[PDB]
Each structure stands twice: as C-alpha cells, then as structure tokens.
Design an enzyme around this catalytic site. Sequence first.
Site, PDB file in Angstrom:
ATOM      1  N   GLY A   1      40.995  57.599  41.566  1.00 20.21           N
ATOM      2  CA  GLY A   1      40.146  58.722  41.188  1.00 20.21           C
ATOM      3  C   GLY A   1      39.143  58.384  40.095  1.00 20.21           C
ATOM      4  O   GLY A   1      38.168  59.114  39.889  1.00 20.21           O
TER       5      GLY A   1
ATOM      6  N   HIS B   1      31.427  53.811  48.627  1.00 19.43           N
ATOM      7  CA  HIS B   1      32.702  53.918  49.342  1.00 19.43           C
ATOM      8  C   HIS B   1      33.260  55.357  49.391  1.00 19.43           C
ATOM      9  O   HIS B   1      34.232  55.586  50.116  1.00 19.43           O
ATOM     10  CB  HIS B   1      33.766  52.906  48.871  1.00 19.43           C
ATOM     11  CG  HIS B   1      34.385  53.172  47.541  1.00 19.43           C
ATOM     12  ND1 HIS B   1      35.434  54.062  47.397  1.00 19.43           N
ATOM     13  CD2 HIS B   1      34.145  52.581  46.349  1.00 19.43           C
ATOM     14  CE1 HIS B   1      35.757  54.028  46.113  1.00 19.43           C
ATOM     15  NE2 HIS B   1      35.008  53.154  45.443  1.00 19.43           N
TER      16      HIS B   1
ATOM     17  N   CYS C   1      37.051  55.909  40.175  1.00 15.81           N
ATOM     18  CA  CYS C   1      35.821  55.351  40.762  1.00 15.81           C
ATOM     19  C   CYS C   1      34.598  56.163  40.407  1.00 15.81           C
ATOM     20  O   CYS C   1      34.646  57.391  40.418  1.00 15.81           O
ATOM     21  CB  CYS C   1      35.948  55.177  42.271  1.00 15.81           C
ATOM     22  SG  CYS C   1      37.212  53.986  42.771  1.00 15.81           S
TER      23      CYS C   1
HETATM   24  O1  LIG Z   1      40.425  49.877  44.485  1.00 18.71           O
HETATM   25  C1  LIG Z   1      40.275  51.046  44.816  1.00 18.71           C
HETATM   26  N1  LIG Z   1      40.490  52.078  43.972  1.00 18.71           N
HETATM   27  C2  LIG Z   1      40.862  52.018  42.619  1.00 18.71           C
HETATM   28  C3  LIG Z   1      39.957  51.839  41.572  1.00 18.71           C
HETATM   29  N2  LIG Z   1      40.292  51.733  40.279  1.00 18.71           N
HETATM   30  C4  LIG Z   1      41.578  51.817  39.968  1.00 18.71           C
HETATM   31  C5  LIG Z   1      42.614  52.002  40.913  1.00 18.71           C
HETATM   32  C6  LIG Z   1      43.983  52.093  40.558  1.00 18.71           C
HETATM   33  C7  LIG Z   1      44.940  52.268  41.518  1.00 18.71           C
HETATM   34  C8  LIG Z   1      44.588  52.358  42.857  1.00 18.71           C
HETATM   35  C9  LIG Z   1      43.280  52.278  43.242  1.00 18.71           C
HETATM   36  C10 LIG Z   1      42.249  52.100  42.285  1.00 18.71           C
HETATM   37  C11 LIG Z   1      39.774  51.433  46.262  1.00 18.71           C
HETATM   38  O2  LIG Z   1      39.074  52.677  46.233  1.00 18.71           O
HETATM   39  C12 LIG Z   1      40.958  51.605  47.220  1.00 18.71           C
HETATM   40  C13 LIG Z   1      41.610  50.260  47.464  1.00 18.71           C
HETATM   41  O3  LIG Z   1      40.703  49.289  48.034  1.00 18.71           O
HETATM   42  C14 LIG Z   1      39.402  49.301  47.585  1.00 18.71           C
HETATM   43  C15 LIG Z   1      38.610  48.262  48.052  1.00 18.71           C
HETATM   44  C16 LIG Z   1      37.253  48.274  47.785  1.00 18.71           C
HETATM   45  C17 LIG Z   1      36.717  49.311  47.047  1.00 18.71           C
HETATM   46 CL1  LIG Z   1      35.010  49.307  46.688  1.00 18.71          CL
HETATM   47  C18 LIG Z   1      37.498  50.339  46.554  1.00 18.71           C
HETATM   48  C19 LIG Z   1      38.867  50.337  46.809  1.00 18.71           C
END
Ligand SMILES: O=C(Nc1cncc2ccccc12)[C@]1(O)CCOc2ccc(Cl)cc21
Lengths: 305, 302
Positions: free
Chosen positions: B143, B41, B145
């Site tokens: 961040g 992603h 990820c």
């Molecule tokens: O969840 C995500 N990121 C985050 C991952 N960890 C913790 C977080 C805490 C606060 C906000 C975001 C977080 C995303 O990158 C954006 C939102 O939708 C999706 C949907 C699918 C995928 Cl594979 C990634 C993401």
Amino acid sequence: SGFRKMAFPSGKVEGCMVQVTCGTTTLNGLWLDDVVYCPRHVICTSEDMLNPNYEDLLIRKSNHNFLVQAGNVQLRVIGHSMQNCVLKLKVDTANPKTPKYKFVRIQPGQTFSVLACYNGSPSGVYQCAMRPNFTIKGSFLNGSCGSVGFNIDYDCVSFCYMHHMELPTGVHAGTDLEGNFYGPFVDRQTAQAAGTDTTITVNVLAWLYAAVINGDRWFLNRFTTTLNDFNLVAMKYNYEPLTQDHVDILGPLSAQTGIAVLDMCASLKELLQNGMNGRTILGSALLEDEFTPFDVVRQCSGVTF
Amino acid sequence: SGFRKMAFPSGKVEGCMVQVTCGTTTLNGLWLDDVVYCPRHVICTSEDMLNPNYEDLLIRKSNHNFLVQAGNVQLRVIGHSMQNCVLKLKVDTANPKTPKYKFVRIQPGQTFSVLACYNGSPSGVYQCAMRPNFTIKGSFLNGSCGSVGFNIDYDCVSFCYMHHMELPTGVHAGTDLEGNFYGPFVDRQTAQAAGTDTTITVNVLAWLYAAVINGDRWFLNRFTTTLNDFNLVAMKYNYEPLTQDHVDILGPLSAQTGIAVLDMCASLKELLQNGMNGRTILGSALLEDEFTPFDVVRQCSG
Ligand SMILES: O=C(Nc1cncc2ccccc12)[C@]1(O)CCOc2ccc(Cl)cc21
Ligand SMILES: O=C(Nc1cncc2ccccc12)[C@]1(O)CCOc2ccc(Cl)cc21
C-alpha cells in the site's frame, strides 16, 4: 519490510512556526490560536543570562519590544505573560493553520518528533527519545531555541517539548509547553550537568520485536527469566528497570511474534552479558532504545496521519 | 552540537499526497498542479503480473476507471497518459497546496527524505540514501507504493523518488518522477535481485568530519595515504572507490577541521582494520554512510 527511525509528518507543526525577536535575540515561537509560545530566555541580554530575574525583565518589556514574524507577515503583539519558563505573546491574529492540538508532558523513555527551526523556518525533522536523565540527544545549533517536540494522535498534535538549551556535553534540555523543564535544569548560564544516562529497557525490547518481525532471529534463545532476575542483571548494565506496565504494553508484540516478554528479556540478558559477537540487529551493532512499543506497532502495521 | 539522521520537514509534500484506486488496487499519488503522478502498476490485474503490457492495459482504461481521492474529496480524472513507469492522471482541479517543485534524478550516495503513505495518508517521514546498487533500504508495507522521496532546498521541493516495489531481500526499488527506474529493475513480478551492496565511502568520510566537528577525535591518526592505496584497501571491505570528485567535495570539511581528505582516509583505513574497540562515533558502533558531504555541512554549519 524495513525498519527506520521515523518521525511524524511535520506539516501540522510547520504551519505554527514563527520567528520571535526581542532586542538582539532571535528564536522560534509556536503560534497556536492568538498566542505565540517561546522560551522566556528570549528577553535576556548577556548580563541577564548569568543571574536572571525574569519577572523583573518581563515587567520592563512592552508589546512593541517583541517582533513576531509569521513568514513575511509581522504579527502584532497585544499582550505578554509568562508561564514558568515559557513566554506567551498574545497576538491580534489567530493562526488559521492552527491544528487540533493538546499540551502533554511526557515521561522518560517516551519518543516524539522534533521540528528543528531557525528564524521561524523549519529545516529538519527527527525522531528522538526523552532520555531517563531528562535530556534529549538532539541536533541543534544556535537559533534553534523554541523548536518543538510533538506526537500525532489521529489528527491531533500533542506538543510535548520546546527547546531551551544545550548542556556542556552536547545534549539538550527543554520544557513542556507549560514551561516546566524536563529534568533538574534551569534556564540560566550556569554550570549544569546531565545525570548519568541509562538505557530505556522497554524500548530495546520493542526494537527486538521489530527485528523479529523483520526476520532477524539470531538473538532468540530457548530461555525465559523472572522479571526480578532480569531487573537485577539490567540494573548492573545501566538499564532502566522493567515494570509490569512495560510487560503489559509489550503484550501485542509478544502475541504477534510468539515470543513472551520474559522470553525476549532472556535474549536481552544474554545480549548484555555476552555482546553481539560481530552480529547486527536491524543493521545496528548497538541495542536501539529510541523506539517505543507503540512506535514499533505503528510502523510494522502502517498507522496513518 | 549533536548529530542526528534528519529528514526534511514533510509539510510541502503532505499537501500533495492523494489516494489512487484502479479496480482493486489502491496506492498513493502525488498531486502537483492538475496532474496526479503514481506508479503505472496500479493498472495491473492478477494476470498482468509477470509480463504486463502497460501500453495495452492503459489503452483499455477510461478516465472513470481511476478513483482519485484527496482527503474526503474525489478528484475527477479528465485524462491519462504514461511516461515510462509513471502514470499521469490529469485531474479537473489544480492542487492549491502545490509547492514550488522540480523533478530531479539523483545519483547513488545521494540522500533524501521519504514520506511513507498508505491510502493517500502520510504516516511517517524518514531519511534514506540511494544505495550504490540503486535500491533504497526503506521501511514500506503493502500500500506504500507511490510514496515519494524528496529534498527541500530553500522554498522548493525536489522530488527524486517514487516507490514502486520491494525486492526479495526487503530492499526497495523505484523510479524518478519521470518514470525511469533507478537500477536494473522493471515493474514486473519477474525474478529480480539487487546487486551486492557497497558502502558509500564519501558519505562515511563526511560523517567522520561531522564527528570531528562534534569533538569525537579518537579515530584520528598521524597517517596519510595515496588515493590509490586507500581504494585498494576500501574495495576489500566492500567500500565504493573514492574518486577525485569525492576528494574535492570533501574540501570544505577538510578546511573546517584542518584534517586533509587523504589524512581522514588513513583514519578510515585504520577503522576498517581494527573496528571500534567498544567505542562509538557519534553514538554509533558502525560507520554511517547515509550522510552526504552536503548534509554534514547543512547540519553542522547551518
Ligand atoms: O513489491 C510490490 N509491493 C510492495 C512495495 N513496497 C513494499 C512492500 C511490502 C510488502 C509487500 C509488497 C510491497 C509489488 O506491488 C507487488 C509484488 O511484486 C511487485 C513487482 C513489481 C512492482 Cl513495480 C511492484 C510489485
Ligand atoms: O544553550 C543555548 N543555546 C543553544 C541551544 N541549543 C543548541 C545550541 C547549540 C550551540 C549554541 C547554543 C545552543 C543558550 O542560548 C546559549 C548560552 O547558554 C544558555 C544557557 C541557558 C539557556 Cl536557557 C540558553 C542558553
């Protein structure tokens, strides 16, 4: 989101862990520059531990009596000296993995990460608080002596603890990196007892702010209290007194959540007098006191090392 | 003595953390040999959010679109490929700090350490369990990820998780290091919900054995139970069914403490019925389920 008990990354400390052997005793040493630091009780036998004269024992030791092993390389000890309860073994090789470091003595309530080692090999890392009675509620088996406690400030390792012993209650005692014990403890096989423990009040408040940051608000109430009224109640429940310094350090969390420190103190006051009523805070049924105000900010803002 | 939630030393993994940037997105990558692994992603824009076609997006990318940074050194991407939900960036330098490693897919109930990173820099290490609903209850901000979950048994790092997303309930979803998600999750912003979580029964039993080894015996009782009767009671408290495999894995702890598995199961039934009565087990007022039978033996016996 999420809140976890989080230790500092241990890599900078793993590069310093060595194995120290003297006679039949084997424990861990911290190799920084050309010195290996370890508990002085490594020089003890069975009779010695009962009533030891460490100056007398160290004087009878030669450099070749200490076997220092860094991985699969034996380090040659070219000197030995004692600083309080820590033994300093001068080696011929400076540790090329020596990070930027400092020796710091911490106060009760402060937290630090522990790199638990056996035979100079790191096996686990966990976060813990220096209890107000100066013990740590660690997880240590025989051979873990010499394991160190640390914090990371930017890229600087602050060494604050070295493990020496386990008290009869399963709690642990140790020293700073200058050999000075935390607490009224001595490094001898003798009847020793930790004082009655108290709750680190500023840390419980910091953890209540972390719960609010994570969306747990059920414990909040309309009430505020005076610092004096709160301390009278808290002391009754074996909680450490909250000072003006603690209120001040809780300022950023108070500004971030919009809940004044004395406002959070009134929630803590009610939590103590009435319990949690079957409810939990951050998945816990007990008030957590091993997260300082700085730990909560570091985790809920993502400070890296 | 003592019992703590303990993570593996993170040094072997810190030496692999790099920062991966594609366009405006910045996340973490795992640099092993001459390959950087990261969530696919990272190639997504604001339009490829709900229904991205990753094969189509990756085909439009060139090696010079990925900015890989290991400390203060930019790594040169000389290839890119996708394996399920993980992006593999071939770099022109092998990581000299690459440890002995393996990619392992874990099962629910398994525990692992998480090295939470931001901008390729490790900021903390904590301990997790793969929940029965395939989520992890982690601590992650935006961040994070690309942060990885691992176990270190001996000299070898077993990479078992890479963080991809946060579900609406604050729980987290990710993949193994081959890009296969744990759970019924997709790397899309479409409506996703974790299934109702349950307690990892075998892990609670392992933790009760750790408490007995540490001298906490107040919850023990003279009762035993059948595995079927225990499962009927446990299921009413949202506890995972205990299988014969779980009874077998609990064998060494049962032999060490002298308390049969079904005997400890009767103590667990009583705890679910009564609660703690203001008492704690290993300093906890709730039954802990993030210590496997293997963790308890490692921490208590050595
Ligand atoms: O969840 C995500 N990121 C985050 C991952 N960890 C913790 C977080 C805490 C606060 C906000 C975001 C977080 C995303 O990158 C954006 C939102 O939708 C999706 C949907 C699918 C995928 Cl594979 C990634 C993401
Ligand atoms: O406490 C010790 N060692 C251990 C330290 N940590 C955890 C342990 C767990 C299980 C057994 C031993 C442990 C001693 O070496 C044993 C004898 O009593 C004293 C007395 C004084 C000193 Cl400074 C050390 C020791």
